[PDB]
Amino acid sequence: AAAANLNAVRETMDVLLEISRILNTGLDMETLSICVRLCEQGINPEALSSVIKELRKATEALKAAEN
Amino acid sequence: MIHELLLALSGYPGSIFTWNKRGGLQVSQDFPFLHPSETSVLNRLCRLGTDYIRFTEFIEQYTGHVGLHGIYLRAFCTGLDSVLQPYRQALLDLEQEFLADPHLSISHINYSLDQFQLLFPSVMVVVEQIKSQKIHGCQILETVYKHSCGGLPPVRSALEKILAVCHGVMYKQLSAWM
Amino acid sequence: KSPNVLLQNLCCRILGKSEADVAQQFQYAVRVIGSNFAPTVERDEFLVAEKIKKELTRQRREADAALFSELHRKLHSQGVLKNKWSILYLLLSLSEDPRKQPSKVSGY
Amino acid sequence: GAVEVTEAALVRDILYVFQGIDGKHVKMSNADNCYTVEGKANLSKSLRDTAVRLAELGWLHNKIRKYTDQRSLDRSFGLVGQSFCAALHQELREYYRLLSVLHSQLQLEDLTLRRLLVWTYDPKMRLKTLAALVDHCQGRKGGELASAVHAYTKTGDPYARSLVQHILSLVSHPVLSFLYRWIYDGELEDTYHEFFVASDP
Amino acid sequence: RQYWTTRSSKFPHSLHLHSNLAAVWDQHLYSSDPLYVPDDRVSVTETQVIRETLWLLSGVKKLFIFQLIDGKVAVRNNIMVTHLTHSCLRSVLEQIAAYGQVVF
Amino acid sequence: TTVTLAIVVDKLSPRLAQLKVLHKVFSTGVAEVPPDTRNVVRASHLLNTLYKAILEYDNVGEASE
């Protein structure tokens, strides 16, 4: 059972990685599972998108200030 | 099903897909559990498999002895085998993909092999022309060039490779003479 | 483990900062999330996929669109996720266009 | 009890019809040249109508298929004709790759008719444009072929325009090669007599 | 299990139609002739078949699948693999066997 | 790694081709020489078969390297 679950999760993660790279979403490795694991809780995906956009804006601002 | 189809395209006739000395590979009409459309698509592929079988028999007959005879005929058989090699590789890749995803359909194989449906008929036409006209020596070069003038880019590339190998032999004999 | 802990970890990873160093940002994020916890519209991934395909076509990537359709088929075939609509919407909202100059005609 | 074909079974039969080979309950009426759903099976009027609307695509498919198969074997049709057949084969293979995706999805289910209609809308446009080009382009060769394509380039629909411009570039590559050879070699490979320069021996 | 051991253990490798085409073919024969009796075939794994073929090409004289009769390497008629048809399996094994006989 | 019979057959294809040529050459060079032939005669027949096969195959070029 656990072997099947591990296989399934590996293949799902690979599929999601490919989908991300084909869509050129721009997201890095750490949004491997946890971010989507949060979205899988039934969280408002629109708000999740808004907040992640805000975090990206803040991160770019901080990297611009640092640079 | 899928493994036996790949085998038949690989040259191993089965129970559903039988080899006829006259017709080549064909789908058995008696194979149950296939939709008739699936049988039709399979027979469309089996036309390619038939041509492949006939090509392989010809290659073995006219290359394995080192009547028409000659090093140019052997070179032709070697060229045909070298041009069919990519088809074999694509068949192996398709086999791996179908082993990888059990939900893949036979239509996936048919798409992956569609490109060969155009190359193979043209080369079979050229082979049958060479056989029927008993082209010998440099007349093989002439025949290959004339058929190479065809408009099919896949055919053009294949015939260019064959012609280049045969010209390499002709040029080798010329080098020996000169 | 807890959704708030996961959000904290995500913000830490995004900012490359400690948990305490993002408290104001984390507080804004908490307010944003607590604004809405449930979706306000029905979930049906077919519309999401259609929108994705339309966006790809608008980005002149029809071959990539076919690839996306294939990958969607593969995912739903090996389905282990029950809330795909959400992840698809997230990825759509996070999609960018690196292969073309930024400009889109307004949709209705 | 009459046989009414399930939605899944009708989907499978129509997907076979789309692949260019008739189904088990919907079959090509060759007295109209389109696929009709048999009346031995009882399906609602809308389902039968949708099936017909979709088998229009199978009709166009089979027409394009027959034309490509037949014209592909004649060396007399010239390099331009062979290139036209190659381009059509390529577009046909794209269509088939989408049809195979839809088949694979059905078998993984093993999808609704309306969703399938939506998925098939764009294929309908592409293959309609290609079949119309083929019909108008029948009975012409060489520079007549090149003109025929340039005439189809005048379409105002942009999807069609891009398709036809790709096809025209592909079809002109041989003609352009001939002209380049005539301009650079001062020689002709014209054994079909499709190039606008005649040599008289 | 030693495939050279006379105890046929039929293990189904999977329930998938594509994985049991041989079983599907035997079922087709049984469904086409209600008097059709499946031949008593020894179930061999594809990996085991490959290994026996490699041993044949390496020069092993006593193979279970490939019987040497009159100096010709022949396939035992009673061999079945779950994922290959008997005719296809036979044809492929015979194609390899012709070279095996030459090497032998 | 998943090794299939097709992969194995393809991997052995060049070796199978070499073996097929070798078997033809061996049959012609040895099996056709009667055992009741004096050792010099058997040797001369084998050597001439080898020489002729070599000359035949040398003209085939790189594809038979």
The amino acid sitting at D92 is: L
**DSSP label at residue C107:** P
CB-CB contact of B38 with B28 (8 Å): no
Interface of B with C in 90-119 (CB under 8 A): 101, 103
Taking each helix axis from N to C terminus, what angle separates B71-100 and B36-63, rounded to the nearest 10 degrees? 150
Residue contact B118–D174, C-beta within 8 A? no
Inform me whether the C-beta atom of residue F59 falls under 8 Å from chain B C-beta atoms.
yes
Residues of C in contact with A51 (CB under 8 A): 29, 32-33
> Which one of F8, F9, F19 has the shortest CB-CB distance to E103?
F19
Q: Comparing C-alpha atoms, which of B108, D107, D119 is closest to residue C49?
A: D119
Method used to determine the 3D structure: cryo-EM
The span from the CA of E97 to the CA of F6, in Å, is 15
CB-CB contact of D113 with D5 (8 Å): no
Inform me whether the C-beta atom of residue E85 falls under 8 Å from chain B C-beta atoms.
yes
3-state secondary structure of B13: coil
Q: Is D95 exposed, middle or buried (0-12, 13-18, 19+ CB in 10 A)?
A: buried
Partner residues linked to E67 by β-bridges = E74
| Integer Rg of chain B from CA | 18
Residues of F in contact with B61 (CB under 8 A): none
CB-CB contact of E81 with E21 (8 Å): no
The amino acid sitting at E2 is: Q
The span from the CA of B79 to the CA of F63, in Å, is 8
3-state secondary structure of B17: strand
Closest chain D residue to C54 measured between Cα atoms? D122
Residues of D in contact with B149 (CB under 8 A): 79, 189, 191
Inform me whether the C-beta atom of residue F5 falls under 8 Å from chain E C-beta atoms.
yes
Inform me whether the C-beta atom of residue A26 falls under 8 Å from chain C C-beta atoms.
yes
Residue contact D100–B37, C-beta within 8 A? no
Candidates D93, D141, D195: best to mutate against B (most CBs of B within 10 A) is D93
E vs F: CB pairs below 8 A = 23
Residues of B in contact with D23 (CB under 8 A): 35-37
Q: How far apart are the first and last CA of chain C?
A: 40
Q: How distant, in Å, are the alpha carbons of B144, C4, C88, E1, F8 from that of A56?
A: 62, 19, 19, 59, 51
Q: Catalogue the long-range contacts made by B39-47 (C-beta closer than 8 Å, 24 or more residues apart).
A: B40/D21, B41/B106, B41/B107, B41/B110, B41/D19, B41/D21, B42/B5, B42/B17, B42/B106, B44/B110, B44/B117, B45/B5, B45/B9, B45/B109, B45/B110, B45/B113, B46/B8, B46/B17
The span from the CA of C14 to the CA of E15, in Å, is 46
- DSSP string for chain D: --B---HHHHHHHHHHHHTTS--SSEEEETTTTEEEE-SSB---HHHHHHHHHHHHHHHHHHHHHHHHHHHHT-GGGHHHHHHHHHHHHHHHHHHHHHHHHHHHHHHHH---HHHHHHHHHHHHHHHHHHHHHHHHTTT--THHHHHHHHHHTT-S-HHHHHHHHHHHHHHHHHHHHHHHHHHHTS----SS--SSPPP--
Q: Comparing C-alpha atoms, which of C87, C100, C86 is closest to residue C40?
A: C86
Q: Comparing C-alpha atoms, which of B159, A45, E86 is closest to residue C85?
A: A45
- Percentages of chain B per state (helix, strand, coil), in multiples of 5: 70, 5, 25
Does chain C touch chain E (at least 3 C-beta pairs within 8 Å)?
no
CB-CB contact of C33 with C26 (8 Å): no
Q: Comparing C-alpha atoms, which of C59, C52, C101, C98 is closest to residue C75?
A: C52
Inform me whether the C-beta atom of residue F51 falls under 8 Å from chain B C-beta atoms.
no
Resolution reached, in Å?
A: 4.3
Residue contact D101–C77, C-beta within 8 A? no
Inform me whether the C-beta atom of residue C77 falls under 8 Å from chain B C-beta atoms.
yes
Inform me whether the C-beta atom of residue C11 falls under 8 Å from chain A C-beta atoms.
yes
Largest CA distance in chain B: 66
Other CB atoms within 10 Å distance of the CB of residue D32 = 9
The span from the CA of B66 to the CA of F60, in Å, is 9
Q: Is E70 left (phi over 0), alpha (psi -120 to 50) or beta?
A: left
Q: Comparing C-alpha atoms, which of B147, B116, B150, B152 is closest to residue B132?
A: B147
Residue contact E88–B7, C-beta within 8 A? yes
What's the distance, CA E18 to chain centroid?
17
| Residues near D162 by beta carbon (within 8 Å), at least 6 away in sequence | none
